[PDB]
Amino acid sequence: DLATGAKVFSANCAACHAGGINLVNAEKTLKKEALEKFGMNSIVAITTQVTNGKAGMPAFKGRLTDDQIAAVAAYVLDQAEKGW
Amino acid sequence: DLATGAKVFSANCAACHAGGINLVNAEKTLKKEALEKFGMNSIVAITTQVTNGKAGMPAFKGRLTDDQIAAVAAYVLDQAEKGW
Amino acid sequence: DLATGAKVFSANCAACHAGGINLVNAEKTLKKEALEKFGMNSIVAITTQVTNGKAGMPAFKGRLTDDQIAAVAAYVLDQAEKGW
Amino acid sequence: DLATGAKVFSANCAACHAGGINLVNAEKTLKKEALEKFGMNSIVAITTQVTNGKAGMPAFKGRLTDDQIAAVAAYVLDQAEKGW
Amino acid sequence: DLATGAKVFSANCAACHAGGINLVNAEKTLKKEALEKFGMNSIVAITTQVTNGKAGMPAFKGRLTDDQIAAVAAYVLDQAEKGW
Amino acid sequence: DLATGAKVFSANCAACHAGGINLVNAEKTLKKEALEKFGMNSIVAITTQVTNGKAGMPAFKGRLTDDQIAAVAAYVLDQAEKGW
Ligand code: HEC
Ligand code: HEC
Ligand code: HEC
Ligand code: HEC
Ligand code: HEC
Ligand code: HEC
Ligand SMILES: [Cl-]
Ligand SMILES: [Cl-]
Ligand SMILES: [Cl-]
Ligand SMILES: [Cl-]
Ligand SMILES: [Cl-]
Ligand SMILES: [Cl-]
Ligand SMILES: [Cl-]
Ligand SMILES: [Cl-]
Ligand SMILES: [Cl-]
Ligand SMILES: [Zn+2]
Ligand SMILES: [Zn+2]
Ligand SMILES: [Zn+2]
Ligand SMILES: [Zn+2]
Ligand SMILES: [Zn+2]
Ligand SMILES: [Zn+2]
Ligand SMILES: [Zn+2]
Ligand SMILES: [Zn+2]
Ligand SMILES: [Zn+2]
Ligand SMILES: [Zn+2]
Ligand SMILES: [Zn+2]
Ligand SMILES: [Zn+2]
Ligand SMILES: [Zn+2]
Ligand SMILES: [Zn+2]
Ligand SMILES: [Zn+2]
Ligand SMILES: [Zn+2]
Ligand SMILES: [Zn+2]
Ligand SMILES: [Zn+2]
Ligand SMILES: [Zn+2]
Ligand SMILES: [Zn+2]
Ligand SMILES: [Zn+2]
Ligand SMILES: [Zn+2]
Ligand SMILES: [Zn+2]
């Protein structure tokens, strides 16, 4: 759910995406407008990138359960709307 | 207008000012409060800096039409109020 | 008060915490959610860190009066709620 | 030559690559090892990217002469070798 | 060895430490002087931190083999000595 | 001397200049070439800026003794020469 995404995000994502930014590839933020722009505004899109990684973003298949992954894709999606 | 500023901003400004920050000179953000503080909160101020550049900010006279420049100064001004 | 925190923040804090970020230790932002997470969401917590510093954050005992310190802890607390 | 190279770099490239870094896409530095790793360790490789751009890196076609681009590409390779 | 070290670093560490920097916690670089200053100038020191993680640095236990971690620790020390 | 210089730098300057970088204003690094380019390659130039501050760089007057500032200026010049 939502409170478990907030916890998973704090443990695995905050280093690079603190408060919705992207320290590694600056334009590829977690902001709503950016998520729309790169077509990552979806639970499908996020859950697959988190799984297989992409460029500087690591893969999280192996250490996140696809229940925690679905939940953190959803936390991302919820703060983006609120925005951050 | 507004939708053409969103496009121009994505193509020319997002590298340094992704989501209203400034990666090059940290305090000189595009946030409302910062725009007021440095007296850049105006279409005049923005359109002239974009044209002639300033320190690490390049000049965009030559590659942006002063119709695209006026529009992106306005996109900046619209996200700042909404804020970002 | 509030307008004097805005001035003190601009003079002493904006270099590292421009618009609520943290350029030095990325996750330790001034955002509401981060302030809660690290237990810095309080005038007590902020006023003591500002005074004694902590890791890369300097101490401001000596150059900020504990009237300016109380006020800037409060500016931080006010933009965090508004958020930034 | 490297002196015109050095002047072009200072005026156009140092905002995002100061000292051989990459502020926008952190792994794509101007250090010799990254230039080798991404296949950008040649005049032609560099001249092509500077001319046309790639992602957050601007196109310099029509802003810099071909001689300026050649010179800046040479300067990058030279600085990389010396260790910036 | 340093070649497997170099490949592991590229694939897992360059996102936050490209060129010996630290994007997340700026003072904790991979430069020889910072490694000495924070007591991280040994294989065992580095292997332990890579394995278990610390704050914003991820744990690599179970993601990288012990041999890969050993090799990456060796590569870090070697690059530090050469000056990245 | 450089040992007191090294201790002062670690305690006061590494937050924004770790390894010779400039986290706040990216082009104004402590590398020898940038120090030359901005006319900051002298003890007097550095002691003056450290003492009085400039823009996002804090004033250290009254926080550091004149001897500490002298020593840190010497250390900067020395590290620049060695290549940080
Ligand atoms: C923790 C599990 C997460 C979550 C939920 C996200 N990230 Fe990252 N991220 C990083 C980089 C370099 C990119 C760009 C990759 C590329 O070039 O395409 C991303 C991208 C994303 C997105 C898409 C954003 C967009 O605007 O397109 C999303 C939704 C996302 N991430 C979520 C870098 C890192 C890290 C640095 C080592 C870490 C850790 C994470 N990401 C972890 C996570
Ligand atoms: C695309 C055309 C744009 C737009 C619309 C803006 N920028 Fe930049 N910017 C950069 C730097 C280093 C500064 C500070 C300059 C200085 O020292 O005075 C700025 C400043 C601005 C402002 C004013 C912000 C303020 O708070 O005062 C504005 C409104 C602005 N910019 C808009 C850096 C860069 C880039 C890095 C290479 C790029 C690309 C751009 N800017 C592009 C744009
Ligand atoms: C001006 C007087 C201020 C104010 C009001 C704040 N800061 Fe900083 N800050 C810096 C660093 C490296 C940290 C992390 C320290 C650590 O490792 O614990 C912080 C932390 C904070 C907090 C807590 C944030 C949190 O989410 O826990 C707060 C409320 C805060 N600061 C306010 C770095 C710097 C600087 C770089 C040199 C400067 C200047 C300042 N801080 C100044 C201020
Ligand atoms: C001024 C004329 C220059 C020069 C000589 C170079 N750049 Fe950049 N750069 C930027 C980004 C985001 C990238 C990555 C692009 C991508 O996604 O692939 C680059 C890349 C380079 C390279 C290749 C480096 C590598 O390791 O592969 C080189 C040689 C290079 N650039 C030279 C970002 C920016 C800017 C920010 C807005 C600016 C300004 C420049 N680059 C300008 C220049
Ligand atoms: C890939 C396998 C690696 C390797 C070899 C290293 N890292 Fe990192 N790192 C990160 C952060 C936030 C820190 C500071 C942690 C803290 O608070 O103490 C570190 C620290 C290090 C060190 C010690 C450096 C020092 O000067 O003390 C070393 C040797 C090291 N790391 C090696 C952040 C990140 C990442 C961002 C999400 C990633 C990815 C890595 N580290 C990965 C690696
Ligand atoms: C600790 C005592 C130090 C020392 C020795 C130096 N700094 Fe900084 N610095 C900061 C910023 C924003 C600038 C640019 C200021 C401007 O707009 O002109 C600087 C600049 C310097 C220089 C000149 C470098 C050059 O290439 O011109 C030097 C020698 C220097 N500093 C030394 C930012 C910061 C900080 C962030 C809040 C802190 C802390 C320091 N500086 C501290 C120190
Ligand atoms: Cl440079
Ligand atoms: Cl430099
Ligand atoms: Cl590399
Ligand atoms: Cl690297
Ligand atoms: Cl590199
Ligand atoms: Cl150090
Ligand atoms: Cl340092
Ligand atoms: Cl260092
Ligand atoms: Cl330079
Ligand atoms: Zn947060
Ligand atoms: Zn990018
Ligand atoms: Zn928020
Ligand atoms: Zn955006
Ligand atoms: Zn940032
Ligand atoms: Zn500044
Ligand atoms: Zn937004
Ligand atoms: Zn602000
Ligand atoms: Zn951290
Ligand atoms: Zn705001
Ligand atoms: Zn330089
Ligand atoms: Zn990258
Ligand atoms: Zn020609
Ligand atoms: Zn050098
Ligand atoms: Zn490298
Ligand atoms: Zn630190
Ligand atoms: Zn084994
Ligand atoms: Zn090197
Ligand atoms: Zn150092
Ligand atoms: Zn950096
Ligand atoms: Zn600058
Ligand atoms: Zn004295
Ligand atoms: Zn060194």
Side-chain angles (χ1 to χ4, degrees), chain A residues 1-60 62-81 83-84, chain B residues 1-60 62-81 83-84, chain C residues 1-60 62-81 83-84, chain D, chain E, chain F:
Chain A
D1 63 300
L2 214 140
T4 184
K7 247 171 277 186
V8 157
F9 190 93
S10 163
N12 301 274
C13 315
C16 300
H17 301 287
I21 77 206
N22 186 323
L23 286 175
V24 183
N25 187 337
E27 314 159 69
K28 282 194 184 172
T29 80
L30 304 199
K31 288 346 193 194
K32 185 83 275 318
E33 312 88 320
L35 292 175
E36 289 179 20
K37 184 177 79 184
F38 300 102
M40 286 289 147
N41 61 312
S42 104
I43 268 146
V44 196
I46 304 174
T47 54
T48 140
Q49 192 150 295
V50 172
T51 294
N52 306 325
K54 162 97 160 296
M57 171 141 166
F60 289 83
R63 61 198 151 116
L64 279 185
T65 73
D66 48 15
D67 305 321
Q68 273 180 314
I69 298 187
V72 71
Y75 179 75
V76 168
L77 283 186
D78 173 57
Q79 319 300 114
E81 273 283 314
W84 248 100
Chain B
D1 63 300
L2 214 140
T4 184
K7 247 171 277 186
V8 157
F9 190 93
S10 163
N12 301 274
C13 315
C16 300
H17 301 287
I21 77 206
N22 186 323
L23 286 175
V24 183
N25 187 337
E27 314 159 69
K28 282 194 184 172
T29 80
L30 304 199
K31 288 346 193 194
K32 185 83 275 318
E33 312 88 320
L35 292 175
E36 289 179 20
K37 184 177 79 184
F38 300 102
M40 286 289 147
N41 61 312
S42 104
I43 268 146
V44 196
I46 304 174
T47 54
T48 140
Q49 192 150 295
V50 172
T51 294
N52 306 325
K54 162 97 160 296
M57 171 141 166
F60 289 83
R63 61 198 151 116
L64 279 185
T65 73
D66 48 15
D67 305 321
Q68 273 180 314
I69 298 187
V72 71
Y75 179 75
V76 168
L77 283 186
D78 173 57
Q79 319 300 114
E81 273 283 314
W84 248 100
Chain C
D1 63 300
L2 214 140
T4 184
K7 247 171 277 186
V8 157
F9 190 93
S10 163
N12 301 274
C13 315
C16 300
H17 301 287
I21 77 206
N22 186 323
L23 286 175
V24 183
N25 187 337
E27 314 159 69
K28 282 194 184 172
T29 80
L30 304 199
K31 288 346 193 194
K32 185 83 275 318
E33 312 88 320
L35 292 175
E36 289 179 20
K37 184 177 79 184
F38 300 102
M40 286 289 147
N41 61 312
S42 104
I43 268 146
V44 196
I46 304 174
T47 54
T48 140
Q49 192 150 295
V50 172
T51 294
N52 306 325
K54 162 97 160 296
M57 171 141 166
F60 289 83
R63 61 198 151 116
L64 279 185
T65 73
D66 48 15
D67 305 321
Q68 273 180 314
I69 298 187
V72 71
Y75 179 75
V76 168
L77 283 186
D78 173 57
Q79 319 300 114
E81 273 283 314
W84 248 100
Chain D
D1 54 309
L2 306 168
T4 172
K7 189 168 155 181
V8 171
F9 193 91
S10 181
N12 303 270
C13 316
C16 298
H17 296 292
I21 71 183
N22 188 330
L23 271 185
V24 180
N25 187 339
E27 311 98 315
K28 277 152 176 207
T29 78
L30 306 196
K31 303 245 253 193
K32 189 223 301 187
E33 298 92 334
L35 286 178
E36 288 165 355
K37 158 169 78 175
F38 292 107
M40 293 290 162
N41 54 333
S42 73
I43 279 78
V44 57
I46 300 170
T47 64
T48 299
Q49 194 149 307
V50 170
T51 305
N52 303 319
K54 185 172 153 172
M57 178 161 155
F60 289 80
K61 181 108 147 259
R63 310 210 264 126
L64 286 178
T65 71
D66 61 286
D67 293 332
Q68 274 170 321
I69 292 166
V72 82
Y75 173 81
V76 167
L77 291 168
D78 185 72
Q79 289 316 105
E81 292 300 337
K82 287 167 190 156
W84 297 84
Chain E
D1 54 309
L2 306 168
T4 172
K7 189 168 155 181
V8 171
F9 193 91
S10 181
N12 303 270
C13 316
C16 298
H17 296 292
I21 71 183
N22 188 330
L23 271 185
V24 180
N25 187 339
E27 311 98 315
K28 277 152 176 207
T29 78
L30 306 196
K31 303 245 253 193
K32 189 223 301 187
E33 298 92 334
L35 286 178
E36 288 165 355
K37 158 169 78 175
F38 292 107
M40 293 290 162
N41 54 333
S42 73
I43 279 78
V44 57
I46 300 170
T47 64
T48 299
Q49 194 149 307
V50 170
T51 305
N52 303 319
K54 185 172 153 172
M57 178 161 155
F60 289 80
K61 181 108 147 259
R63 310 210 264 126
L64 286 178
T65 71
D66 61 286
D67 293 332
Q68 274 170 321
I69 292 166
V72 82
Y75 173 81
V76 167
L77 291 167
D78 185 72
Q79 289 316 105
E81 292 300 337
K82 287 167 190 156
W84 296 84
Chain F
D1 54 309
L2 306 168
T4 172
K7 189 168 155 181
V8 171
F9 193 91
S10 181
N12 303 270
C13 316
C16 298
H17 296 292
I21 71 183
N22 188 330
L23 271 185
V24 180
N25 187 339
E27 311 98 315
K28 277 152 176 207
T29 78
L30 306 196
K31 303 245 253 193
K32 189 223 301 187
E33 298 92 334
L35 286 178
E36 288 165 355
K37 158 169 78 175
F38 292 107
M40 293 290 162
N41 54 333
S42 73
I43 279 78
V44 57
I46 300 170
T47 64
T48 299
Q49 194 149 307
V50 170
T51 305
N52 303 319
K54 185 172 153 172
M57 178 161 155
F60 289 80
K61 181 108 147 259
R63 310 210 264 126
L64 286 178
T65 71
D66 61 286
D67 293 332
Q68 274 170 321
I69 292 166
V72 82
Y75 173 81
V76 167
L77 291 167
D78 185 72
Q79 289 316 105
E81 292 300 337
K82 287 167 190 156
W84 296 84

